[PDB]
A paper describes a structure:
Reversal of PARylation is predominantly carried out by poly(ADP-ribose) glycohydrolase (PARG) in nucleus and cytosol, whereas ADP-ribosylhydrolase 3 (ARH3) may play a role in mitochondrial PAR degradation. PARG comprises an N-terminal regulatory/targeting domain and a C-terminal catalytic domain. The mouse PARG catalytic domain has a bean-shaped structure, with the active site in a deep cleft in the middle on the abdominal side.
To understand what caused the activity difference between the mPARG E748N/Q and E749N/Q mutants, we solved the crystal structures of these mPARG mutants. Interestingly, while E748N and E749N mutants were completely dead, both E748Q and E749Q mutants still retained residual PARG activities. In contrast, the signature loops in E748N and E749N mutants have significantly different conformation from the wild type PARG. In wild-type PARG structure, Cβ and Cγ of both E748 and E749 residues are semi-buried. Mutation to Asn, which has both Cγ and Nγ linked to Cβ causes a spatial collision. Therefore, the conformation changes in this catalytic loop completely abolish activity of mPARG E748N and E749N mutants. To study the enzymatic mechanism of mPARG, we tried to soak the catalytic residue Glu748, Glu749 mutants E748N, E748Q, E749N and E749Q with the iso-ADPr, which may be the smallest PARG substrate containing the α(1→2) ribose-ribose glycosidic bond to be cleaved by PARG. In all above four PARG mutant crystal structures, we were not able to observe the electron density for iso-ADPr at the “active” site of mPARG. For E748N and E749N mutants, this may result from the conformational change in the active site associated with the mutation. Our work revealed precisely how some of the PARG mutations (e.g. E748N, E749N) disrupt the PARG activity through significant conformational changes in the PARG active site.
Numbering used by the authors: 442 to 515, 525 to 957
Write the structure that this text describes.
């Protein structure tokens, strides 16, 4: 009949907050921006900002804030215009359109609001729609205009090559995302913009356009979030860390043993990987590409844990050797389905514990797989190393002892319609985690046959005591003997059968 899970029992895997290191005092440093008063940080209490009063930096190293004195429009304060536009009664979707357009006159022809209109009138029921413009919208306006009182410290841009963290409160994020809803962020809109060309869009204008059925679902999911945040203010902190490694394992010679594996075709990363390092199948432009298009794994996580979206404000396109690590985000929505079948189910009430820094024990890492538009490309040794390096970067924690690292909760990273081979990518992640000295928890999402195969291969390589280097050498043998001279889209003999054969015919 076939089992539901294989390998190590999931309750034997290291998980937060149990496995956690003893956190030192939270404090600002060269590599850590802290936007809250640490001495006044108390459990279940809304964090006070630091500094007390708004300081502005309008430069190329910080986020260009909408409440800045240097944000200008036809010449006067664009922020005071934002205030006059938003301090109005909404009763019809066009009011909100005309409000957002008052400080975006150049995009009146480019920004379509049809999806907003049709959500307002067709999707929402009368009472649901009334509640939106009577309460939710005015409450989002109020927290959006309180931005200079809420976010007082200039937020550094996490540029490529930077190894830097930013710890802010959820309440601060709420105000930033509310601003992103109303499309207040300057310099972020133009097609021929220069400074932020290598950053994803932050303004939510694209969620209002078109005649697609995906749009109302994304709006349901976000309005759920905004409803919660405006009715009951969140009290925790969230950390955003960009990691960028220059040096990587010498994969051919790496002597590190494979680690433990739990593999299952039932469960989810977000549901069953609680307290573990949860992988986000990212786009290099985090949160779903420059544009935010799609309802795929990354898009979904960003919608159900909306606080992740704010990373699009200050996170530059990820390079090959980089990742973004986010600790502390809350789950607000529950969902069903995927892509065209994605549906908002109901609100979620997050019951996870917190660490000493008041961050929820939820660690997500954004690692972008490559898009293999030609199938064979991934077996090319350099492309394997690339995937190895990207995964390793997401899993490695410099200076943290292995017994303090949670298991990695992951799945079919970059696979399916993205072109990656599940069996290869499973092996790549396994090797990467071994080099990082973390155990693996792998979700195959319904594919029971894949669960088996990954399990059999892991067991094979563990019992035969093949280290990372020995396994990686098998991947090179596969390319040379089966891939480089292949005239067909895929080779006659698959990876795993070749690996078994290669090892069984040795010594």
């Amino acid at each position: 009949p076939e089992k539901k899970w294989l390998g190590t029992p999931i309750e034997e895997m290291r998980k937060m907050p149990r496995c956690g290191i003893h956190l030192p005092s939270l404090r600002p440093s060269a590599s850590h921006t802290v936007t809250v008063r640490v001495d006044l940080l108390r459990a279940g209490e809304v964090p006070k900002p630091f500094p007390t009063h708004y300081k502005d930096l309008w430069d190329n190293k910080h986020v260009k804030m909408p409440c800045s004195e240097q944000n200008l429009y036809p010449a006067g304060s664009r922020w005071e215009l934002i205030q006059t536009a938003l301090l109005n009664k909404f009763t019809r979707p066009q009011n909100l359109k005309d409000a957002i357009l008052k400080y975006n006159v150049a995009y009146s022809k480019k920004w379509d609001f049809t999806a907003l209109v049709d959500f307002w009138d067709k999707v929402l029921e009368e009472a649901e729609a009334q509640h939106l413009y009577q309460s939710i919208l005015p409450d989002m306006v109020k927290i959006a205009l309180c931005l200079p009182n809420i976010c007082t410290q200039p937020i550094p841009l996490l540029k490529q090559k930077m190894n830097h963290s930013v710890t802010m409160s959820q309440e601060q994020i709420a105000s930033l995302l509310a601003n992103a809803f109303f499309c207040t962020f300057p310099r972020r809109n133009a097609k021929m913009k220069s400074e932020y060309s290598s950053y994803p869009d932050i303004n939510f204008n694209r969620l209002f356009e078109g005649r697609s059925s995906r749009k109302p679902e994304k709006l349901k999911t976000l309005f759920c979030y905004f409803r919660r945040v405006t009715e009951k203010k969140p009290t925790g902190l969230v950390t955003f860390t960009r990691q960028s490694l220059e040096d990587f394992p010498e994969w051919e010679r790496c002597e590190k043993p494979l680690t433990r594996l739990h593999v299952t075709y039932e469960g989810t990363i977000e549901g069953n990987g609680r307290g573990m390092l949860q992988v986000d199948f990212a786009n290099r432009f985090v949160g779903g590409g420059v544009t935010g298009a799609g309802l795929v794994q990354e898009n979904i996580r960003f919608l159900i844990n909306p606080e992740l979206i704010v990373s699009r404000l200050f996170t530059e396109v990820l390079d090959h050797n980089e990742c973004l690590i986010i600790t502390g985000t809350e789950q607000y929505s529950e969902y069903t389905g995927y892509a065209e079948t994605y549906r908002w189910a109901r609100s979620h009430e997050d019951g996870s514990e917190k660490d000493d820094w008041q961050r929820r024990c939820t660690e997500i890492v954004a690692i972008d797989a490559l898009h293999f538009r030609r199938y064979l490309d991934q077996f090319v040794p350099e492309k394997v190393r690339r995937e190895l390096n990207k995964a390793y970067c997401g899993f490695l924690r410099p200076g943290v002892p292995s017994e303090n690292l949670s298991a990695v909760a992951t799945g079919n990273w970059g696979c399916g319609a993205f072109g990656g081979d599940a069996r290869l990518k499973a092996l790549i992640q396994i090797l990467a985690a071994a080099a990082a000295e973390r155990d693996v928890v792998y979700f195959t999402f319904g594919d029971s046959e894949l669960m088996r195969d990954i399990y059999s291969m892991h067991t094979f390589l563990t019992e035969r005591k093949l280290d990372v280097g020995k396994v990686y050498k098998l991947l090179l043998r596969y390319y040379n003997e089966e891939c480089r001279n292949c005239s067909t889209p895929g080779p006659d003999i698959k990876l795993y059968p070749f690996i078994y054969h290669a090892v069984e015919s040795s010594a």
